[PDB]
Amino acid sequence: MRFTFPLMAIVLEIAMIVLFGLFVEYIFFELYPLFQDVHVMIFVGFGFLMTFLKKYGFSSVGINLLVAALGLQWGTIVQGILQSQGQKFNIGIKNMINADFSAATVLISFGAVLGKTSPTQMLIMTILEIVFFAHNEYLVSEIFKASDIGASMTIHAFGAYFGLAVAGILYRSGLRKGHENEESAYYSDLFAMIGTLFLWMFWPSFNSAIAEPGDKQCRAIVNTYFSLAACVLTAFAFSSLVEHRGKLNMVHIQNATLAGGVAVGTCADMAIHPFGSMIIGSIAGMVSVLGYKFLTPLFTTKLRIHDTCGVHNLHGLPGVVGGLAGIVAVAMGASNTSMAMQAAALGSSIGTAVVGGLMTGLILKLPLWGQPSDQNCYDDSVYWKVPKTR
Amino acid sequence: MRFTFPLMAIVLEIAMIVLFGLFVEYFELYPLFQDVHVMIFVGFGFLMTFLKKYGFSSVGINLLVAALGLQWGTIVQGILQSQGQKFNIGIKNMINADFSAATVLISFGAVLGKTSPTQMLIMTILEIVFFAHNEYLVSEIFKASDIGASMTIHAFGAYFGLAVAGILYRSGLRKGHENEESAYYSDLFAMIGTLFLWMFWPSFNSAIAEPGDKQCRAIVNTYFSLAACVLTAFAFSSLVEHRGKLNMVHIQNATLAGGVAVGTCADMAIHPFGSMIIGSIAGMVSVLGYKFLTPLFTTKLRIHDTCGVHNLHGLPGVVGGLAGIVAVAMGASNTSMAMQAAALGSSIGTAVVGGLMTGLILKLPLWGQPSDQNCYDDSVYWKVPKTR
Amino acid sequence: SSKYPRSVRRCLPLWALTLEAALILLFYFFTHYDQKGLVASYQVGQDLTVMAALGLGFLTSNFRRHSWSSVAFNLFMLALGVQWAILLDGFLSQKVVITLFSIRLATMSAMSVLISAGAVLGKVNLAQLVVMVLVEVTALGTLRMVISNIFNTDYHMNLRHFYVFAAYFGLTVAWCLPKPQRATIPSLSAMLGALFLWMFWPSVNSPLLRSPIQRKNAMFNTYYALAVSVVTAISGSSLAHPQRKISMTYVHSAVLAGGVAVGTSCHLIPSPWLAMVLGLVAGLISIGGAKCLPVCISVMHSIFSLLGLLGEITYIVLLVLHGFQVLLSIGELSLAIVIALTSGLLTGLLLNLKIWKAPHVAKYFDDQVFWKFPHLAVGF
Amino acid sequence: APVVIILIILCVMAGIIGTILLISYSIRRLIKA
């Protein structure tokens, strides 16, 4: 009613404390440099990337921080339980890098329903989506034994289609034509560029954190580096191509420049060669810009699925492209493991994302969590004390 | 033609892909690489965002130019190292690619607000070739000690940009422009880049140093040089302004001159007191340059420097080169002193010649240069939101 | 008197250049130079430098018209404090051998002053901040030397009291000052600073520690306590506000509640559940302080002091599990508090001197006092 | 020899851009009139 948000948060935190006491007990100083970069990615790049809205910066960054902070505690619990099969487990550096990858998935899903959800809905969505993501990624990594070190399938596509399903269930008829608060500002776009640049710079550590030390980790770093390099050029070119009068659009520069890093995730550690990584990045940037120009209006107006940040065009379509690139790389002899398991991992990721997002959105659609009205969407004043001056 | 920029970008990307296919083959330096990467893409990107109506172009063209630059510099530097043969891509190649991107961004700081993205792509492509040839000359022919690259990066980029801006001189912008003015929150955003550059500069000066004593000496010298440079820059910024006011341009830029001027002597045994003296002189020179020499260049020499990158990179770069010459003369290094002097002179001359050639190429009215009225405006190339 | 600021074109340049020349001469006369894990050791201090500059500079930049001064003065104070802390730690713990570890300790000592300056930013000019930096670094070094002489602990390991010392020093200096708001974009920049402080803090409560196990256990304890404190602080901000809304300034203040709570005893917490419990307790205490302290100058500094004393108390409790030791540790805490209050009183008395050309009380939190702006009438 | 290769690459890129721009300008001058 008025105490639902703090009460749910304190109950969840006490539950996390009890679960940590029940199950959690205490190379590290080697992967810690890369963990710090992923943490900087999770808590700054996603946090400020979604602050492009002119009246939703506070909620964007604060709910990003809250969601990721609860995620690193819930993802640790669930992933450790799944790996240990119900027994007590010890936490090392890799255990806290996977918990920031679960937080990344939840933030990608948050990017779809941004501006139209309450913090209570975000708590519930984090709790459910971490369980669904962890089960799907355990399936992919251990049952299918697919090679998804950069997680184009388990993280990016999963979160994008999860958020699409949640936004589809939480569809608002009043926001289909548009909203007055759903537009960017100059300094909000500068903060979004802060987030974009941090994600872009630290993505190689994101892709190469869990990779096997030695040749595979170096290959992941190099491939992500040059894929992002190609993606920036192609994203700028196609943003100038598709927009009116050749004017660059800041949404394209803020989002589509990371599509190369998103798409090279599955093929990060494989011997796809730097030219192959650059080709993947160029194609991903072109696909992301074309998606932002054409498919997002089609998703919003025709399919009744509104995507606030366009996380489909950044995480899903480049994620599916990354899964297809992994299948092709397996076909072209660039790595071990079968094509069939890569295809099964991609299909299971998409399907589990859709089903879990449907269930989570159904739970979120209940009139209990204080979701805003159609008038108050993309407005910080619903939950935050906004200063008078900008 | 509005299709010049996407066509050129696509052609350049395809060329980079082909070159990486033809010439390129397949970890304790990775954190230093990440620090340099953060410097290149955030510090320089936001340092130039002080203009109230050019933040979008500054940060976006920084990202685009540096992204093209890392690939093109990788190819060119690898070709120069391997004498036209294939080469493996390690962490050092990525660090040197970011260094080439840094040089191009330093040059871009001079003509910010008066150039198109197409002109920036062309300038990047030509400047990388000139810079990499000069760097190969200094590193392998003269074999000078420039581990912080005061002469090969900062001075080279500064004088390259000065020559380009001199060729691209506009008579209508010599007395100022209404859009060439900073804003409050724009300066607040520029402080982000200033702080990131200041914090991560020791890794910039110690990334490719020899492991052991030289790397630690580079780190410590850069740190203390910056520490002294901040205090002296604040003092002289208060000194040169009316009623002791602090100018935001000085605090944004001149606080970083200590890292530039200590670059040549970073790995040398110049002692922390020597590094502090170098940083203090660098801060004083940078503030004096911003106060007096920039209007002199703009009005009398007809060379307009938008970000004042001369006072940050050229004069501190020349100071660092002369400091290297002196330190070799004082026995702090086992390099030749005449080689250090030759490196400084060759860097300056190659920068000037390459800047003249590139500026002559860029003056062709084909790349979509903005009019004199529309300079320092994002609306020429970007979709600008209605509100701030 | 006149509310228009007096000219500092001769005070500030002379003062700063004299300080820099004295530091250069002292480094020449008293300092000296001198592997496999050089990068790994250098990253602990680079993280401390990142926090000290960026997070502590932007965290206090939340003011409507004081962001420039906050960021630039924080940078200046860090630059002066690191050098003076190097020199003082050399002079009080023995020439001075400069290493990465010594730079790390000097960065911690400067972080103490930067945390203290949050209570006085917007009410002092640059010269007063120089005086505060010098006096606070000297007082912290004196406190560490006294504790090392009395309780036979190491001088460098006595730097653990730095947060509570900083809190009480800042409280006292702010109290001695003459007696006398936000915007969206400065609050977002302050959020950036608070995020950087929160993300790397696990690295602040692990520098003094040397054993890798103690360092691993400290990072793990601070990373989970900070997350449980962030959740608690963001959730409970609605309760401790008259308008029942989330306050961004309170979030900026109370993100580090768990890190401060377990800062002194992170290496002695054996299981993550206890660290999460301490983080939850710190978050609830922060909510209570936000709702309670304004009833009885800066509120965030008061909650910082409460967090520091709570962390000290839980350090006392967790020292016994891992009758005379309790009394000795309470004596350490009392001596640190007494020295902090006395040095804060001395600093506030010095800062009230008319020679510093302090701004008028009607010009507080205004960048127009210190910074050049266009289209302004200049001079009398 | 590396200098020759770099100059050759620059010549190829410059020739491609110049030929495309020349074709575009010729088509424009033939089409506008």
Side-chain angles (χ1 to χ4, degrees), chain A residues 1-26 28-29 31-390, chain B residues 1-27 29-388, chain C residues 1-209 211-243 245-380, chain D:
Chain A
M1 48 315 286
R2 207 276 290 272
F3 305 115
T4 166
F5 174 50
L7 199 271
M8 178 169 301
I10 185 71
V11 167
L12 288 182
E13 274 297 331
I14 293 182
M16 297 320 148
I17 291 177
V18 173
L19 290 178
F20 263 83
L22 286 177
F23 300 107
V24 182
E25 282 186 340
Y26 289 126
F28 173 97
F29 288 106
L31 292 184
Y32 191 70
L34 290 73
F35 169 72
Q36 280 190 331
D37 303 1
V38 170
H39 204 66
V40 173
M41 262 182 68
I42 301 317
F43 284 86
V44 175
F46 286 106
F48 282 89
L49 170 63
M50 302 183 297
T51 55
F52 64 97
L53 298 171
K54 73 173 188 299
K55 292 183 59 178
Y56 210 71
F58 283 178
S59 285
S60 302
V61 63
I63 300 309
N64 188 99
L65 170 66
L66 169 80
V67 159
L70 182 61
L72 68 86
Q73 312 170 20
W74 185 226
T76 297
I77 285 294
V78 177
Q79 290 169 338
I81 277 296
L82 240 47
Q83 288 293 327
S84 67
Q85 304 157 352
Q87 309 300 136
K88 292 172 59 63
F89 61 100
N90 302 3
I91 45 183
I93 191 57
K94 271 193 171 66
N95 274 207
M96 38 168 31
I97 306 180
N98 293 283
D100 271 354
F101 286 150
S102 62
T105 303
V106 184
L107 295 180
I108 291 173
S109 296
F110 182 33
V113 296
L114 180 74
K116 305 163 298 180
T117 51
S118 63
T120 306
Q121 280 183 322
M122 278 317 295
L123 299 177
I124 300 175
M125 204 179 84
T126 302
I127 293 301
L128 301 175
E129 185 184 351
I130 284 188
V131 178
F132 282 107
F133 155 84
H135 283 77
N136 170 70
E137 79 145 2
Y138 178 79
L139 171 71
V140 165
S141 59
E142 309 298 326
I143 284 87
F144 295 160
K145 309 245 189 60
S147 179
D148 200 15
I149 193 63
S152 294
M153 303 180 298
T154 50
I155 286 181
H156 298 299
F158 191 94
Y161 287 102
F162 196 101
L164 283 191
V166 174
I169 302 296
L170 295 178
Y171 160 77
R172 298 175 178 264
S173 56
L175 308 192
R176 193 168 67 93
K177 55 181 175 299
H179 198 271
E180 58 169 359
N181 300 331
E182 190 193 351
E183 70 175 14
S184 64
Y186 184 84
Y187 299 109
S188 294
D189 276 332
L190 286 183
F191 283 118
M193 280 304 298
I194 294 180
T196 294
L197 287 177
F198 270 105
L199 286 181
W200 191 92
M201 295 171 323
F202 286 161
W203 217 289
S205 304
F206 189 87
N207 283 343
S208 63
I210 321 289
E212 175 73 17
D215 301 358
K216 282 195 169 184
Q217 206 164 37
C218 172
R219 285 210 297 259
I221 293 180
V222 170
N223 291 341
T224 306
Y225 186 60
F226 290 116
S227 182
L228 285 168
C231 186
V232 168
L233 264 288
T234 42
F236 267 83
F238 276 81
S239 179
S240 181
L241 261 179
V242 303
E243 289 292 88
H244 182 58
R245 292 182 59 187
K247 313 285 188 177
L248 298 176
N249 197 312
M250 248 302 169
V251 185
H252 307 159
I253 310 304
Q254 284 162 8
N255 285 269
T257 51
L258 321 168
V262 171
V264 82
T266 300
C267 291
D269 56 350
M270 307 181 183
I272 67 171
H273 202 268
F275 100 98
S277 68
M278 292 166 64
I279 290 179
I280 292 178
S282 302
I283 295 176
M286 166 182 55
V287 164
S288 189
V289 175
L290 291 177
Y292 265 111
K293 181 56 183 180
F294 303 104
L295 196 62
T296 302
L298 182 65
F299 264 60
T300 295
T301 51
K302 248 63 67 178
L303 272 72
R304 321 287 166 157
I305 301 180
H306 187 267
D307 196 356
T308 305
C309 297
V311 300
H312 185 236
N313 321 284
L314 171 55
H315 303 282
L317 284 182
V320 173
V321 164
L324 298 182
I327 295 177
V328 172
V330 169
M332 296 291 294
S335 179
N336 48 9
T337 230
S338 61
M339 288 181 299
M341 289 301 106
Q342 300 291 135
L346 175 60
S348 70
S349 302
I350 298 181
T352 47
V354 167
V355 174
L358 291 181
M359 273 185 286
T360 306
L362 284 181
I363 299 184
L364 292 188
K365 205 173 171 296
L366 297 171
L368 300 172
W369 327 113
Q371 46 267 77
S373 63
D374 293 5
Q375 170 197 352
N376 301 326
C377 286
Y378 321 104
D379 202 337
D380 271 336
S381 59
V382 195
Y383 312 105
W384 298 74
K385 185 250 243 299
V386 186
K388 168 170 51 60
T389 322
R390 170 174 180 83
Chain B
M1 183 173 62
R2 84 173 184 89
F3 294 88
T4 300
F5 169 72
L7 162 73
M8 180 163 301
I10 289 179
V11 167
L12 288 181
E13 180 53 51
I14 289 180
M16 295 315 142
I17 289 178
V18 172
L19 290 180
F20 270 83
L22 289 181
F23 296 116
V24 158
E25 293 290 337
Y26 279 111
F27 189 74
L29 263 62
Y30 181 63
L32 303 176
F33 158 73
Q34 281 294 342
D35 290 331
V36 174
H37 207 53
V38 169
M39 277 182 68
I40 301 325
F41 283 84
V42 166
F44 288 101
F46 291 95
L47 182 62
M48 305 180 295
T49 55
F50 64 98
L51 297 176
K52 57 176 162 57
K53 297 170 67 177
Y54 209 73
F56 287 178
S57 300
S58 56
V59 62
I61 298 310
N62 190 98
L63 172 62
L64 166 74
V65 158
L68 174 65
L70 66 92
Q71 325 170 70
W72 182 226
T74 297
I75 287 301
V76 174
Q77 289 170 329
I79 287 305
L80 286 176
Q81 287 291 335
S82 61
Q83 313 298 330
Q85 306 279 21
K86 292 192 181 182
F87 50 91
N88 309 329
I89 295 302
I91 194 67
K92 291 221 173 188
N93 297 89
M94 307 161 69
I95 295 178
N96 292 271
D98 278 3
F99 285 166
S100 54
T103 306
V104 184
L105 292 178
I106 290 174
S107 293
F108 166 58
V111 290
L112 174 93
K114 301 161 299 179
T115 47
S116 63
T118 305
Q119 278 184 313
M120 271 320 115
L121 301 180
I122 301 178
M123 197 190 74
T124 304
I125 293 302
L126 304 184
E127 184 189 351
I128 283 184
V129 172
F130 278 102
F131 154 79
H133 281 82
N134 162 76
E135 173 176 275
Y136 178 81
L137 175 69
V138 172
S139 303
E140 318 293 334
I141 308 299
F142 297 155
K143 298 185 186 63
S145 57
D146 198 11
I147 201 61
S150 297
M151 305 172 301
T152 56
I153 285 183
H154 298 285
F156 193 94
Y159 285 92
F160 198 99
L162 286 191
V164 169
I167 300 299
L168 294 180
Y169 157 73
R170 300 169 177 263
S171 58
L173 262 63
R174 192 173 56 86
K175 290 188 180 62
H177 195 264
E178 68 275 2
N179 294 332
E180 192 190 6
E181 180 180 338
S182 59
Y184 192 69
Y185 298 134
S186 303
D187 289 319
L188 176 59
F189 267 91
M191 284 310 299
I192 307 180
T194 294
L195 283 188
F196 271 105
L197 287 158
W198 183 89
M199 294 175 321
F200 289 148
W201 218 294
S203 307
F204 193 91
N205 280 15
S206 64
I208 56 178
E210 296 182 357
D213 288 4
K214 284 189 176 184
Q215 200 167 29
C216 192
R217 289 207 292 264
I219 290 179
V220 173
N221 291 337
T222 314
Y223 193 92
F224 282 106
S225 181
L226 287 172
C229 182
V230 166
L231 260 61
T232 45
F234 268 79
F236 264 80
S237 178
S238 182
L239 181 69
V240 302
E241 298 288 339
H242 288 310
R243 301 194 60 85
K245 294 287 182 295
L246 297 175
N247 190 11
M248 242 305 171
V249 183
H250 303 168
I251 305 303
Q252 282 166 10
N253 292 262
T255 57
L256 310 161
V260 177
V262 84
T264 303
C265 308
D267 59 328
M268 306 185 187
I270 63 176
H271 287 329
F273 96 98
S275 67
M276 287 164 59
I277 293 177
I278 293 176
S280 301
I281 296 180
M284 165 186 62
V285 165
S286 187
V287 176
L288 288 177
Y290 266 112
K291 188 55 186 185
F292 303 106
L293 209 58
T294 298
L296 201 147
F297 274 22
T298 299
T299 68
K300 293 302 165 55
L301 298 196
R302 273 71 189 267
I303 300 177
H304 185 273
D305 192 357
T306 295
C307 295
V309 301
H310 184 236
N311 317 309
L312 179 54
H313 303 282
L315 289 179
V318 174
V319 162
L322 299 181
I325 298 171
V326 172
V328 171
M330 294 289 294
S333 178
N334 290 276
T335 338
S336 176
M337 164 169 48
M339 283 308 108
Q340 300 292 146
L344 177 59
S346 177
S347 302
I348 290 185
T350 307
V352 169
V353 173
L356 288 188
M357 298 177 60
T358 306
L360 282 184
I361 293 188
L362 289 184
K363 212 196 185 310
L364 302 175
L366 317 172
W367 325 115
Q369 303 88 310
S371 61
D372 299 4
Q373 328 300 320
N374 291 333
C375 289
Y376 321 105
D377 200 356
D378 276 333
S379 55
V380 190
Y381 307 100
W382 296 79
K383 173 201 168 304
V384 180
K386 283 80 55 184
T387 61
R388 299 271 295 190
Chain C
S1 183
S2 181
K3 309 188 188 305
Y4 195 67
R6 281 168 57 186
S7 177
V8 293
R9 205 177 183 179
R10 296 141 200 92
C11 179
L12 186 59
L14 262 299
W15 184 222
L17 290 178
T18 299
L19 232 307
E20 183 54 47
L23 288 177
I24 286 182
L25 212 54
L26 245 44
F27 265 84
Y28 169 75
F29 280 118
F30 296 100
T31 64
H32 184 254
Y33 259 153
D34 267 311
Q35 306 297 139
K36 354 241 64 179
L38 193 143
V39 178
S41 59
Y42 166 64
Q43 285 175 274
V44 196
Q46 192 190 58
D47 292 9
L48 301 199
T49 300
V50 163
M51 263 179 306
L54 202 85
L56 289 174
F58 281 91
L59 182 66
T60 55
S61 67
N62 212 127
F63 299 110
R64 193 176 65 87
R65 297 293 305 189
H66 201 261
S67 56
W68 290 9
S69 298
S70 296
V71 176
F73 291 171
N74 197 87
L75 176 63
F76 187 90
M77 288 184 293
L78 176 64
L80 178 65
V82 170
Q83 308 170 80
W84 181 235
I86 284 292
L87 282 175
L88 190 89
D89 291 359
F91 288 157
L92 290 185
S93 61
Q94 301 298 327
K95 297 149 64 68
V96 191
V97 181
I98 286 183
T99 56
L100 293 174
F101 190 78
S102 57
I103 295 181
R104 186 186 313 179
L105 265 45
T107 307
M108 297 182 63
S109 303
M111 281 193 68
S112 176
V113 188
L114 293 180
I115 294 177
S116 265
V120 305
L121 273 180
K123 302 182 289 296
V124 290
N125 58 327
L126 195 48
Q128 290 179 302
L129 285 180
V130 175
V131 177
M132 185 180 182
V133 163
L134 295 179
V135 174
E136 184 171 1
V137 173
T138 309
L140 184 56
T142 304
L143 180 269
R144 289 146 66 193
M145 175 184 59
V146 167
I147 293 186
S148 65
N149 285 20
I150 295 183
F151 298 90
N152 291 329
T153 58
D154 195 301
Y155 176 85
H156 302 336
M157 300 306 138
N158 289 323
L159 199 44
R160 74 162 198 273
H161 292 282
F162 92 105
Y163 193 89
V164 59
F165 178 86
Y168 282 108
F169 190 93
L171 280 179
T172 315
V173 175
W175 178 76
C176 291
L177 291 185
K179 280 79 182 180
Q181 260 287 80
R182 315 294 177 173
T184 301
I185 304 165
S187 293
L188 283 177
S189 61
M191 189 58 175
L192 178 72
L195 283 173
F196 269 87
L197 269 174
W198 182 89
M199 291 182 309
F200 295 100
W201 201 264
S203 308
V204 122
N205 309 331
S206 67
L208 290 190
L209 299 189
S211 180
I213 293 296
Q214 297 257 324
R215 304 212 305 97
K216 202 169 296 79
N217 288 0
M219 242 110 55
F220 269 112
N221 289 335
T222 304
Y223 162 91
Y224 289 117
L226 271 178
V228 175
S229 69
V230 145
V231 178
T232 309
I234 293 184
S235 67
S237 181
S238 58
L239 304 182
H241 215 48
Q243 5 188 161
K245 251 67 177 303
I246 310 179
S247 184
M248 193 53 139
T249 53
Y250 170 73
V251 173
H252 297 164
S253 313
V255 275
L256 279 317
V260 172
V262 307
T264 55
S265 61
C266 36
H267 59 287
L268 302 179
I269 294 178
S271 191
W273 75 266
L274 190 54
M276 294 176 65
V277 162
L278 287 188
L280 191 67
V281 168
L284 294 182
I285 263 65
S286 306
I287 299 160
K291 204 179 180 179
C292 177
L293 291 168
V295 177
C296 70
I297 298 298
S298 185
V299 189
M300 60 176 182
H301 262 248
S302 299
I303 202 52
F304 287 164
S305 63
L306 291 185
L307 269 35
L309 83 93
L310 195 270
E312 287 286 343
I313 282 298
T314 189
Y315 181 70
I316 307 318
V317 176
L318 291 178
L319 183 62
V320 187
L321 301 184
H322 290 267
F324 197 25
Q325 222 95 127
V326 186
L327 294 184
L328 288 185
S329 59
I330 290 180
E332 293 184 9
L333 174 60
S334 60
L335 183 60
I337 261 58
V338 165
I339 289 194
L341 296 184
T342 304
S343 54
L345 284 173
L346 197 270
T347 314
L349 289 186
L350 287 185
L351 261 46
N352 279 261
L353 264 49
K354 261 62 180 180
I355 56 177
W356 310 125
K357 303 172 183 57
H360 195 268
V361 304
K363 294 299 180 178
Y364 282 173
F365 314 105
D366 199 1
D367 279 339
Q368 196 180 10
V369 179
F370 323 106
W371 296 91
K372 166 183 178 179
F373 289 94
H375 312 141
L376 291 191
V378 178
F380 274 144
Chain D
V3 191
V4 182
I5 286 184
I6 294 163
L7 289 181
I8 281 178
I9 296 169
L10 266 180
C11 174
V12 168
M13 289 151 54
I16 290 179
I17 269 75
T19 43
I20 295 181
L21 282 178
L22 174 70
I23 292 176
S24 67
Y25 128 86
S26 59
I27 290 183
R28 280 179 259 180
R29 69 100 141 85
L30 287 184
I31 264 56
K32 181 56 65 184

